[PDB]
Design a binder for this molecule. Structure first.
Ligand code: GDP
Ligand code: MG
Ligand code: MG
Ligand code: MG
Ligand code: MG
Ligand code: MG
Ligand code: MG
Ligand code: MG
Ligand code: MG
Ligand code: MG
Ligand code: MG
Length: 140
RNA sequence: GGUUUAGAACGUCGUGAGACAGUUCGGUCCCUAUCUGCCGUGGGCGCUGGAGAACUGAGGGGGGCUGCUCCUAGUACGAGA
């Protein structure tokens, strides 16, 4: 019946300020879980998550897209876990898209830039996570 | 080709010959370079015995243009765009 045990289920989000690396990291994820053959890049318009024509041209993610993957581990330590990743926009123009997605997700990976780190949308998403009380980790 | 010759016509002006910052069709453009100038190219003598060569370099000239793509770098700046 159930393909993967519920314990081997991660529902995660990638919310962060604009150009924090949220979309690129999902591409590196789709690469290091083998689900995507090419690493890709947003400026080239290559990123899969940005499927919308506008998102390709502007490089912006104007919608949240959800994808899943199986990362057994870095040493194949665990049986493959199905990570449900909901990549989100960080443009305050689209704020529902992060919150619409946020209640559903069980955990949050909040990206930050090493040059800037907390930048204004970053506080905005932090506040959103606190309202849905997602337990959080961070990728700088 | 135009402009302003001789032909012809139109509109207009004049009685007319003709004329018009009116138009229209047609209508012959010569010169073997003496001098300067310039581009090349030599002959003479000179540079202090004659010759063969290799140079130095005053000075003179030539040349000096730029696009696009990628890279730095989606980096600086920018809440973003
Ligand atoms: N230098 C550098 N650039 C990165 C890194 N991660 C992402 N980027 C660039 O940041 C820009 C925007 O990243 P993206 O993930 O589209 O931004 P987001 O969609 O707003 O998270 C893209 O040009 C990426 O190439 C990184 O680790 N280093
Ligand atoms: Mg951009
Ligand atoms: Mg994005
Ligand atoms: Mg003529
Ligand atoms: Mg005659
Ligand atoms: Mg006549
Ligand atoms: Mg002649
Ligand atoms: Mg010179
Ligand atoms: Mg010169
Ligand atoms: Mg670039
Ligand atoms: Mg625009």
């Amino acid at each position: 019946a159930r393909t993967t045990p519920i314990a081997r289920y991660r529902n995660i989000g990638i919310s962060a300020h604009i150009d924090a690396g949220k979309t690129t990291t999902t591409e590196r994820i789709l690469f290091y879980t083998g689900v995507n053959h090419k690493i890709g890049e947003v400026h080239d318009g290559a990123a899969t998550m940005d499927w919308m024509e506008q998102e390709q041209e502007r490089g912006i993610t104007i919608t949240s897209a959800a994808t899943t993957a199986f990362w057994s581990g870095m040493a194949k330590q665990y049986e493959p876990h199905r990570i449900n990743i909901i990549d989100t926009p960080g443009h305050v123009d689209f704020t529902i898209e992060v919150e619409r997605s946020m209640r559903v997700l069980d955990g949050a990976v909040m990206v930050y830039c090493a040059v800037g780190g907390v930048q204004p949308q970053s506080e905005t998403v932090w506040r959103q996570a606190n309202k849905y009380k997602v337990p959080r980790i961070a990728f700088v």
